[PDB]
Amino acid sequence: KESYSVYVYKVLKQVHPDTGISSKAMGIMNSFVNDIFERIAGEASRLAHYNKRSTITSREIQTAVRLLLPGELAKHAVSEGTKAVTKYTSS
Amino acid sequence: SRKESYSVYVYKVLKQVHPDTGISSKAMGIMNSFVNDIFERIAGEASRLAHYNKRSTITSREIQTAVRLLLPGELAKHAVSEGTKAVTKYTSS
Amino acid sequence: GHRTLASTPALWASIPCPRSELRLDLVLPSGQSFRWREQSPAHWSGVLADQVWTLTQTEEQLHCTSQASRPTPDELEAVRKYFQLDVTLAQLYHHWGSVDSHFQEVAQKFQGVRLLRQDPIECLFSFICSSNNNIARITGMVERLCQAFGPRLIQLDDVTYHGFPSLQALAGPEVEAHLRKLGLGYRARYVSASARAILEEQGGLAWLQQLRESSYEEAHKALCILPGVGTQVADCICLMALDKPQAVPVDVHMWHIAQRDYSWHPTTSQAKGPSPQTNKELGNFFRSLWGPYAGWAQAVLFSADLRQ
Amino acid sequence: PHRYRPGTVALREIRRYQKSTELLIRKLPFQRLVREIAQDFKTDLRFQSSAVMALQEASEAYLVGLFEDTNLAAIHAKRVTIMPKDIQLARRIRGER
Amino acid sequence: PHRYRPGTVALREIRRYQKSTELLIRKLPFQRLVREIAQDFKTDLRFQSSAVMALQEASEAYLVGLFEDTNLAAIHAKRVTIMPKDIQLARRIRGER
Amino acid sequence: VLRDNIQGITKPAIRRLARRGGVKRISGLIYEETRGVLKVFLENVIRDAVTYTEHAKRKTVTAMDVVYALKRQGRTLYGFGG
Amino acid sequence: KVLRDNIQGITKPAIRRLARRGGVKRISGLIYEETRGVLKVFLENVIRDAVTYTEHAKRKTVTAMDVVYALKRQGRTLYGFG
Amino acid sequence: KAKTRSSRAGLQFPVGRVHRLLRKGNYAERVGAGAPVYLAAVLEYLTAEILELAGNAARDNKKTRIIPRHLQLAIRNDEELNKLLGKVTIAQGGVLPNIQAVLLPK
Amino acid sequence: ARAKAKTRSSRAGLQFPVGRVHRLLRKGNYAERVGAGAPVYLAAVLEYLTAEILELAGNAARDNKKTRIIPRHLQLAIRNDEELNKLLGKVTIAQGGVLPNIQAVLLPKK
DNA sequence: ATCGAGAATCCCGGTGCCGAGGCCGCTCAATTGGTCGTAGACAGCTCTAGCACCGCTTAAACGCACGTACGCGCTGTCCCCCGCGTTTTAACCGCCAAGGGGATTACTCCCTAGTCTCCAGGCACGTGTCAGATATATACATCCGAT
DNA sequence: ATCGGATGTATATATCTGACACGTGCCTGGAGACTAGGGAGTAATCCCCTTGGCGGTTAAAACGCGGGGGACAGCGCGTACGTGCGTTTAAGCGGTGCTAGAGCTGTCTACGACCAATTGAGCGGCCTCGGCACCGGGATTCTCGAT
């Protein structure tokens, strides 16, 4: 069963290096990540259909981020996304 | 441009329901958008079952399940009966 | 340009053959061979025995023609063999008519539909292109396939005739990609794939040619191995290129004919519509109805059903 | 000088504005308001008239629903006149907040 | 002969039940009721224990939200008690009919 | 399983739920109303869950189907798989 | 092209008429300010999404389709227009 | 001669068009044969219900046309249609006439 | 020869799996084709949200003198932040409980 | 509880006006053709998780007694909202003009699906091991009934 | 205002233990290279749809000005709901067994595939006479001032 358990555990070490997490909380984070993935992917699919475009590119992923995430959270999320894409393209 | 719609088809249904009743353009637009909304809901849920059961295709039973999930009460029963009758008649060509 | 009986009289030779024994207009464009064209009214041109010919018929004669002289007796024999003229169609029609009154009704209006002796290789790949398709398109596909990979023969007007491609050529590199650009669709893979299987796994040409001495059961079995060659295609080849006169191809046309003209329905099968089991049953049905030359009787109704 | 009951004209008004289906809001001031709201997100932005009409219809429907809910809230409080308390309760119960 | 005043241990245990995160509804009665509801739509349905737990948690969260909104409706009418009128009101604004 | 299981949610359970909800004083007529509300919500969820199970050609109701049916009604639930 | 003080454009009679359509019998004086506030909030919520949809399509005007999509995203689903 | 699928299934909504949008809409890479027919039948039933109710409402108001007021009124008076359409506004639809009891004069 | 395999998550400096997200997107039939930058963008967004949630939950756990994250801490993290509450207003967390709040007049005479 | 003046409302017929619908033109959109390869329906088979059942124990329900504080009824007070009349005003409708951008169309190019050939990142699996449950013992925070 | 009795938490400590965290084995999903082609970015165009202006009429907004009626504060009462307690019961807890269905595998009947002819409905263009808003008028019913 494909999951995000080890990745969330990796991120937890970055955030609080000396904090443990229960398996129930691991499952909740897994479900949360799956739900947010489903929301963004589905809404970006709606943008792709609305613009008569058959490719899901980063522009409408960013638009979906701006639509779903709230105000100040959206600015940080879009900043992280642009930073990641620029790093990927440069490297 | 060629904007497609269900206006003529709604008119055909209207003629076999109330033969002597007219209808306005605004009402026709509302009816077309209603058809589009119900179509999109049912198709979305039918495709959603396909992922939930790991099915790679949409058959006539996913549509029935989606109708039973969406339509409340006696609409579900009568729509299921209508769909079963229609698919049976189509198969018995 | 293409010759006509009236323009170059001293270039045609005849073969005794009454219209009741052969109707070119009912055989050449009916999906048996896809290489004949009525370039001029009542005159059909195509490749026969590695050379070009034009054929036209009167009431009791079949007229045939860088040729600069009339066809020789040896060459004319090539034509008789292609049309299997030693087989008397009148005797066959009589028999089929006697055991099937429906055939008798149709046979009154569609006389002269006989079967063509054919080359195994040409027949195999032409019918591999026949599948899920219409005669008009199939004809084009086969023409482009021969122009691209077959030997160049002679040119008449703006038409350049080509011999049928060899196994080695069809098995060549990038043939599939070429045939897809020529519009063969997915059958492009079938052609490439089957040429190689025959050459690299089945023992080359000899394997396909030996089938003519093998039994229908064996032959049909052997062909089903090749990509693009299931039951309908295999039967087509057995009947038209391997001398299996009892082979009966079952397509959509014979599916409808059985249903509306004989009120036929599967009994041993489980499915109520076309399936590998029902198709096989329909074939036996026709075999028990018409006999040893059931495939030839099939050719008559198929040709007649095209005229709708 | 004959004068009506202070509430009877109000109920007449209820019946009159629940009978018909006109807009009840002047179009041009609403359009000006919409453009004023829209300028802060993106300057030099044009509007299609149908979009403005859609906005006005949706806003009217939302306000009518909100007023119905807050009327229920006021009635539940053994009252007739609505209060901002009622509106805030309607928004909290609905979940907009 | 010592007694706490009404509304003191009533005001308490609110902190206790907001502190805890347990279920507050007995498992077996909810099992029986879920099976009873199930037998109407289809006869003899099997239920995983996880399914019953998920149903219990969903219904309990729903009821907690409903009781919060009921408390809002009750506090609105200058009442500390909650009456069923509050429940129909909260359902009506929430759109549950 | 047969009958009279709605009394399974006794008065103290509802009282405890209301205490968690921030309710101080509960009238007598609350328990019957909330029992009815719980019945309505439970059947409205169970209908969709059983529909999912029946479409799955199963006879056992999984937690996964209950989660999906809850997601259909806008009450997304976390912790029982995705 | 600056627009200032247009929230007052939502006149008191218009709010009165909207409340009348909502079946309200008597209106206080603070209701006008409160409903101006809630209308401003709701229009900001809608226009944010509408302008993002317009900006995505590389268009410089807000079409009705964008408003319909923005409303359907929030859960309004207005028919008719488009 | 071609015999269209809608007439073959005794339906008016175009089965072919529903099938086209089902394929193009990217719901699954494969769409079964009977599913568009079932969808078209369901759409027929819903449209027939809403038009017969709208026509009844229109004749109630001595009107030979259907206007958005008629559609909104027909949707709101019916119960199951209202539940299906509980989260929708209708453009130019107005509201159902409803006056609370305590607002009436004594 | 091949120049050794390095994951795109390392290429973009992410911890969340870029390739897994790409696979889910392409087999999730969300569109006919999937762009190159979209999986990286979405993985970064998911990583940022997870980092925010975990940071707030860790703060809540520290304030409760537990070193292990439990769903009660997740509930406090979600509903003690205004924006996160708005983002996840329509979700129920199993074993999450409810945040503590009491209405003012319920409190006794001062 | 009626009479009745008066105002809002309902019914009937004429008038004209624009739009719903019918008809024609033209055009792309389902439909099908000499099928075969291929995924889902179905039977097979294991094994496990759900069902039933019983006995023990004790924590929860509950039936009951009792007191008290809350909801509700009732009252007078007063302030403020509504009906109404008069006075601005800017909304609306009609008309006109100018140009910005949004569909379009043609063109190219390069980004990505698909595919072949690997390989290590991450998923079962097993095992140490300590954060937390848990029982026990003390510290103090706060209701509360007098005082 | 206050004070200790008494509950009810807060705080601290010893002692297990089973979820948590870690290393390990292994393979399958991820990655690198390479190729073909079509989705998409870009330039030119036109036309049309939006913005803006200008002016005349007037429906509607603003505003003052009563006055009654509804919001609201205060008081009483009696009853319905809390707190506490002895008693019952049934809900967990723990076994033990039964087994029917859940899930994974191994075979062969319904769709995709290429796309070009083939109509044939489906939409655009364009009248056209009728449904219905509006007016003009008169009669009906509701409403509040009077007894």
Residue numbers in the entry:
A (entry chain H): 34 to 124
B (entry chain D): 32 to 124
C (entry chain K): 12 to 76, 83 to 325
D (entry chain E), E (entry chain A): 38 to 134
F (entry chain B): 21 to 102
G (entry chain F): 20 to 101
H (entry chain C): 13 to 118
I (entry chain G): 10 to 119
From the article:
The general mechanism of nucleosome binding and 8-oxoG recognition by OGG1 at SHL + 4 are similar to those observed for OGG1 bound to 8-oxoG at SHL-6. However, OGG1 binding induces modest structural rearrangements in the nucleosomal DNA during 8-oxoG recognition at SHL + 4, which includes minor groove widening of the nucleosomal DNA without significant DNA bending. The lack of OGG1-induced DNA bending is likely due to the inherently bent conformation of the nucleosomal DNA near SHL + 4. Despite these subtle differences, the final conformation of OGG1 and the nucleosomal DNA in the OGG1-8-oxoG-NCP + 4 and OGG1-8-oxoG-NCP − 6 structures are very similar. This data strongly suggests that OGG1 uses the same general mechanism for 8-oxoG recognition and repair at solvent-exposed positions throughout the nucleosome. Notably, the structural changes observed during the recognition of solvent-exposed 8-oxoG by OGG1 are incompatible with binding 8-oxoG proximal to the histone octamer, as this would result in significant clashes between OGG1 and the core histone octamer.
Mutations caused by oxidative damage are primarily prevented by the activity of base excision repair (BER), which eliminates 8-oxoG in duplex DNA. Cryo-electron microscopy structures of OGG1-nucleosome complexes indicate that these effects originate from OGG1’s ability to flip outward positioned 8-oxoG lesions into the catalytic pocket while inward facing lesions are occluded by the histone octamer. Cryo-EM structures of OGG1 bound to nucleosomes containing 8-oxoG revealed the enzyme uses a DNA sculpting and base flipping mechanism for repairing 8-oxoG in the nucleosome, providing a mechanistic basis for the elevated mutational density at bases facing the histone octamer.
